[PDB]
Amino acid sequence: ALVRLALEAEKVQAAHQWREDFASNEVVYYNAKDDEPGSQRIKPVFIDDANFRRQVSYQHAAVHIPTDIYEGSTIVLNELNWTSALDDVFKKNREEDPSLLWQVFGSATGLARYYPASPWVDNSRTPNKIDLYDVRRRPWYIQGAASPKDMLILVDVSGSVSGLTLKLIRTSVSEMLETLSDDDFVNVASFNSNAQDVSCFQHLVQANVRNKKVLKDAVNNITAKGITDYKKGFSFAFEQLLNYNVSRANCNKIIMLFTDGGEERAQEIFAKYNKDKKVRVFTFSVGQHNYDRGPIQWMACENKGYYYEIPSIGAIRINTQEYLDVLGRPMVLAGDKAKQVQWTNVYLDALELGLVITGTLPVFNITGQFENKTNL
Amino acid sequence: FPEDDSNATNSNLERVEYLFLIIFTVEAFLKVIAYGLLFHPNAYLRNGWNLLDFIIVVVGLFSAIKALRAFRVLRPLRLVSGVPSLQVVLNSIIKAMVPLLHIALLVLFVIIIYAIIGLELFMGKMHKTCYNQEGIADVPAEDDPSPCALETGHGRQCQNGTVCKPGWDGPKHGITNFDNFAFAMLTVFQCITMEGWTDVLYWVNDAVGRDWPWIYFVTL
Amino acid sequence: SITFFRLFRVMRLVKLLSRGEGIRTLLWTFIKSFQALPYVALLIVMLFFIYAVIGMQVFGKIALNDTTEINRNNNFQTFPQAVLLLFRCATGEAWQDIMLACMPGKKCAPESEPSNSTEGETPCGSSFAVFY
Amino acid sequence: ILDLLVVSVSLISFGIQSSAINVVKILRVLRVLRPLRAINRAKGLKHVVQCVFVAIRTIGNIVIVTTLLQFMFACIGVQLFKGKLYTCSDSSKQTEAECKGNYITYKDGEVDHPIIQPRSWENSKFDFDNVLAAMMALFTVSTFEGWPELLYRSIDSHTEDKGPIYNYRVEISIFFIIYIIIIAFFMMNIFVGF
Amino acid sequence: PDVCFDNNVLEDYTDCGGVSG
Amino acid sequence: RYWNSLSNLVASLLNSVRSIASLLLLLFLFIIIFSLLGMQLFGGKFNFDEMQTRRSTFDNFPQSLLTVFQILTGEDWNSVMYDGIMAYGGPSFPGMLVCIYFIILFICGNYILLNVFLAIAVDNLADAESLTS
Numbered sequence A: 001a002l003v004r005l006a007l008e009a010e011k012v013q014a015a016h017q018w019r020e021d022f023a024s025n026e027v028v029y030y031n032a033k034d035d036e037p038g039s040q041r042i043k044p045v046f047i048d049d050a051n052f053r054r055q056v057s058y059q060h061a062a063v064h065i066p067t068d069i070y071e072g073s074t075i076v077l078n079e080l081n082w083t084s085a086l087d088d089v090f091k092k093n094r095e096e097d098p099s100l101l102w103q104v105f106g107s108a109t110g111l112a113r114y115y116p117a118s119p120w121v122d123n124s125r126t127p128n129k130i131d132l133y134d135v136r137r138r139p140w141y142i143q144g145a146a147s148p149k150d151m152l153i154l155v156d157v158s159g160s161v162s163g164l165t166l167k168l169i170r171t172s173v174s175e176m177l178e179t180l181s182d183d184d185f186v187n188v189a190s191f192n193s194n195a196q197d198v199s200c201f202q203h204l205v206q207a208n209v210r211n212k213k214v215l216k217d218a219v220n221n222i223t224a225k226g227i228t229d230y231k232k233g234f235s236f237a238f239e240q241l242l243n244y245n246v247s248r249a250n251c252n253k254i255i256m257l258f259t260d261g262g263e264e265r266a267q268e269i270f271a272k273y274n275k276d277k278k279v280r281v282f283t284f285s286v287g288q289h290n291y292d293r294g295p296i297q298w299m300a301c302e303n304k305g306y307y308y309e310i311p312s313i314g315a316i317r318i319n320t321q322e323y324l325d326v327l328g329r330p331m332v333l334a335g336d337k338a339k340q341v342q343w344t345n346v347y348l349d350a351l352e353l354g355l356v357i358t359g360t361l362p363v364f365n366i367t368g369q370f371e372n373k374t375n376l
Numbered sequence B: 001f002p003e004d005d006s007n008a009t010n011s012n013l014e015r016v017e018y019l020f021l022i023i024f025t026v027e028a029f030l031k032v033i034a035y036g037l038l039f040h041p042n043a044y045l046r047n048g049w050n051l052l053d054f055i056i057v058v059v060g061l062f063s064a065i066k067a068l069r070a071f072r073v074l075r076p077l078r079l080v081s082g083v084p085s086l087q088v089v090l091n092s093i094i095k096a097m098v099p100l101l102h103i104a105l106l107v108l109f110v111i112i113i114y115a116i117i118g119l120e121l122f123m124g125k126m127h128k129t130c131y132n133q134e135g136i137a138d139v140p141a142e143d144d145p146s147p148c149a150l151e152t153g154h155g156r157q158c159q160n161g162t163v164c165k166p167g168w169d170g171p172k173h174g175i176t177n178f179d180n181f182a183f184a185m186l187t188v189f190q191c192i193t194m195e196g197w198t199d200v201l202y203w204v205n206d207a208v209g210r211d212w213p214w215i216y217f218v219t220l
Numbered sequence C: 001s002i003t004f005f006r007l008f009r010v011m012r013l014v015k016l017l018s019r020g021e022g023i024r025t026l027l028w029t030f031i032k033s034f035q036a037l038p039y040v041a042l043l044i045v046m047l048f049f050i051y052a053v054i055g056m057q058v059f060g061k062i063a064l065n066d067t068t069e070i071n072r073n074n075n076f077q078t079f080p081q082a083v084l085l086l087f088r089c090a091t092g093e094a095w096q097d098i099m100l101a102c103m104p105g106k107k108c109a110p111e112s113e114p115s116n117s118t119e120g121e122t123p124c125g126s127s128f129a130v131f132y
Numbered sequence D: 001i002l003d004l005l006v007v008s009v010s011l012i013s014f015g016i017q018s019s020a021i022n023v024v025k026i027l028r029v030l031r032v033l034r035p036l037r038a039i040n041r042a043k044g045l046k047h048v049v050q051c052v053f054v055a056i057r058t059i060g061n062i063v064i065v066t067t068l069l070q071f072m073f074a075c076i077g078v079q080l081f082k083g084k085l086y087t088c089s090d091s092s093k094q095t096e097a098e099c100k101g102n103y104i105t106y107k108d109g110e111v112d113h114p115i116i117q118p119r120s121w122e123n124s125k126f127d128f129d130n131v132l133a134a135m136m137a138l139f140t141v142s143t144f145e146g147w148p149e150l151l152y153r154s155i156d157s158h159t160e161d162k163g164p165i166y167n168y169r170v171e172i173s174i175f176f177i178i179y180i181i182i183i184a185f186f187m188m189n190i191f192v193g194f
Numbered sequence E: 001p002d003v004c005f006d007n008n009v010l011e012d013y014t015d016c017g018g019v020s021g
Numbered sequence F: 001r002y003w004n005s006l007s008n009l010v011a012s013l014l015n016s017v018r019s020i021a022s023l024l025l026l027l028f029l030f031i032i033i034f035s036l037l038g039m040q041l042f043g044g045k046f047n048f049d050e051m052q053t054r055r056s057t058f059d060n061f062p063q064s065l066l067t068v069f070q071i072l073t074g075e076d077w078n079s080v081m082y083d084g085i086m087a088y089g090g091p092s093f094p095g096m097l098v099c100i101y102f103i104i105l106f107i108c109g110n111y112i113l114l115n116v117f118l119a120i121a122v123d124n125l126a127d128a129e130s131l132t133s
């Protein structure tokens, strides 16, 4: 079922014409979590079913759009326009196996289109019932968006980071740790004229619930003081990634620096520990300040990494889950041999269904494949 | 920087501080040797000598192992001594300021009297808030509710579960209040410059009522 | 409940003002400058009176609200409160915020004759308030 | 004007609903000038009103040149900040075409307290677009009231229809400073004339 | 797991987050 | 300039500027000294609250100059005084004397500013006396 869905989705997206005239012609779809120009809504019938412990309809597929994503933009409109072709294959899949549970396509733009149609979840409309669901952060999405990694979070705890930016750094580190799974290994270090571990681990750990809790509790107790020294910190980070005496993953050695700014590039350390660019370096500039952000971007660009800015709590959610786009380039380039179904851990369904396991298969973009034009 | 940081530029300034200190020290030594028993009467010479001995002391203390660097800010004033036709302006300004002593003393007496009046009228009537459950108010808490439903009828705690709860630090951060003597004098000085006195008047009105403090504020 | 008498004690400090000589004659000759003072004072209080009256006439329909520059202590209907507001504006305490608080779109309380606000239009327009 | 007061006394009920309510009840405030007219013979009018009129007449060119400089600075500010002073609620969006939804704000901070609020595109209170406008803004700046807020709002503006940066174009603040000094050079001058 | 995908030589990676803005 | 009712006044203004450039540079030097003192004494201690960065700080030199100018104009100096007091702990015997700084910055310099206006009087004394030729 997953393979057929992925094939149909790729074929439909390949032959699609971009447009910006959604005012004249509207996209018709049923939206969940409800009850604007360019969109028409659908009123379902919502019969009651015995398999799903709620009311569902077998005539169209519901769409969930997160709160911060406005459903009137042209990207979302095009997404709905070209994803409206998955309903027929959804119906065929459910007709083949009537015992089929939820089928879902989670887009990279934020919206998740699932079948059968059913209203989103709510708990008595209490004030503490805001919908913060984001399909791009669900583990069944992250496990198929990339491969296991060997992340080592390097945190700036120098004196120039005390204040709002230190709190932002702590929150960002917690949200970054929230994206990891059991197959990934992580450790957290800090540096202020001296690099040291933030907890009792001293090396990479399997990053399960207990270890992640320990790391979060250790990172929520750090203080800012002393001068900054990027050379010692990066030496420590590269040394901890060359252990091989412990259990590891050996799949993605990445260094995720959290800082504000500086004037040090430290070319010698990078030319010493990775001449062959075997370790990616992602860089984050956190808070509102007036420090130079040049060397940070140079570090992000020289190594096959990326550079991000997190100026407020609002951007933490989105600007900490974007590194999976960079880590997915080799998988896309491999292409056909990377179309393998993966099954995830046991977790509680967000639509009140119990304990479930989710199959996973990514979908590639193949527009202009027979002409080899863009490839960007 | 917040807590002892640097960017390789402050270190160079610290290094050149030694050169500046050496230049000033040798200049002072040669000048005092040339003058002998004459370096004393001139005030600017004594100021420069004080600056140099102070910077020697602070650099020695730093080499032994902080805020004394603030005295370096007194160095640019020496420039005024260096350039002529500028000290006469300061002398004229001082001469013009001299006959204002009576007015300054009268202002001091008035502010002292008003501070004492405020101390007598208000002692601790600005330490209550509409706390809901335990020492926390839903409002930003800067309000000054009624003193537990007494003769004063302002700042009523009728918000469906709000009490006086006399356990508050005070308005702002406990800085603007008529308790103690320094606080009252500072508040009177703040009100006499016509900056933010309306907020103080409103807080006092919420504390005790709008049938008394307005006379005090308008008279001030 | 009566503490007005204790305020007399600090008044003894006023005796210390009589000790000085230059300050005494300075204040004596300055307080003696009440010859042309009454006419100018009457002109100023007349200006305040007329401005307060016209303001309470046009800026009526009080809106008891917080964080809107129009509160229980900052009203525009009672004459002493209007005079206090004008005095505050003269002293220069966020008068531009007060001006912005009086704009054509400004919902105001139904405390007036429209007890249920059955008018649709906010009774605090004051299109010329800026000029005022 | 007493005749007008008569039309205020009479119960006027014309087709206009605002009859004898605000059209004429605001023109009846001219009742305090009657004592002035009565005491115009000596009393406090022989030299009080005359001196005020002479003083206000004798200023003239100073006021007109101050107004001319105000107009010039308003034009300069319009050419500088014509549409730059704009923002949105979440401050994470730049164009006006993208700030048309809802966003999460965490009360005052400390996380774990989400609050969903609509996105709105708003100007910087005191507008600077038209030359008819942007003069009351400079008047407020010259009165030393709220000018730091406008200064820090206009320091970090850029492009034409985009949101602000933290500290882009810090130097432009000197403009404001110059204006202030110029205004002072006239505000202290006028007193001297008197 | 044994299947790992990383470090492909045909990766562009010319679009970092700094030089593009 | 079709009228010439201000020619003597304009010439007097130009000469007065050329003469009181000394007063202007003295005021600028005073502002520089107090800005340096404020930057050294306070510096980056205005980030105690983890809510929002305050614009009026003493981090940089231009920022210190802007803050000193704002205080000199007298617009909203109480908030800066409160921030400075809260930087040194809170309301207490050692943590309250720093406000003395602000007091000086509000009086002596302001007095200097007033004296500047005094020079203008003398300038107009050169105009009215020139009115009778």
Ligand SMILES: CCCCCCCCCCCCCCCCC(=O)OC[C@H](COP(=O)(O)OCCN)OC(=O)CCCCCCCCCCC
Residues within 6 Å of the ligand: B097, B100, B104, B107, B108, B185, B186, B189, B192, B193, B194, C092, D143, D144, F073, F074, F103, F107, F110, F111, F114
């Ligand atoms: C807690 C201990 C307090 C100890 C205080 C000791 C003070 C001794 C000297 C008394 C000085 C009191 C000054 C009170 C007047 C302040 C004032 O009234 O400030 C508002 C006004 C609104 O005007 P505005 O246009 O709206 O804005 C500003 C545009 N400039 O500004 C001014 O006139 C500034 C006048 C300051 C004169 C001070 C001269 C002191 C000379 C004595 C030195 C020995």
Ligand SMILES: CCCCCCCCCCCC(=O)OC[C@@H](COP(=O)(O)OCCN)OC(=O)CCCCCCCCCCC
Residues within 6 Å of the ligand: B067, B068, B070, B071, F087, F088, F089, F094, F095, F097, F098, F100, F101
């Ligand atoms: C020419 C002006 C003279 C310069 C003054 C220098 C004298 C020494 C001042 C600093 C004293 C010192 O050794 O520094 C202690 C610090 C550190 O501790 P805190 O910062 O409190 O700790 C944060 C807790 N979270 O402050 C204090 O304890 C009280 C400081 C009291 C003196 C300042 C008064 C200002 C002078 C006004 C001049 C016009």
Ligand SMILES: CC(C)CCC[C@@H](C)[C@H]1CC[C@H]2[C@@H]3CC=C4C[C@@H](O)CC[C@]4(C)[C@H]3CC[C@]12C
Residues within 6 Å of the ligand: D130, D131, D132
């Ligand atoms: C709808 C909003 C944008 C307002 C309408 C357009 C505004 C910006 C335009 C329309 C007409 C314009 C006015 C037309 C004529 C004059 C006379 C000139 O000597 C000074 C400027 C002034 C007074 C203009 C200022 C700007 C103005 C008021």
Ligand SMILES: NCC1(CC(=O)O)CCCCC1
Residues within 6 Å of the ligand: A102, A103, A104, A112, A114, A138, A348, A349, A350, A351, A358
């Ligand atoms: N199983 C995926 C869900 C909930 C989840 O993301 O865990 C979302 C799409 C529709 C089915 C439910």
Ligand SMILES: [Ca+2]
Residues within 6 Å of the ligand: A158, A159, A160, A161, A227, A228, A261, B005
């Ligand atoms: Ca640093």
Ligand SMILES: [Ca+2]
Residues within 6 Å of the ligand: B193, B194, B195, C092, F073, F074, F075
């Ligand atoms: Ca003032």
Ligand SMILES: [Ca+2]
Residues within 6 Å of the ligand: B194, B195, B196, C092, C093, C094, D144, D145, F074, F075, F076
């Ligand atoms: Ca003010």
Ligand code: NA
Residues within 6 Å of the ligand: A343, A344, A345
């Ligand atoms: Na698995």
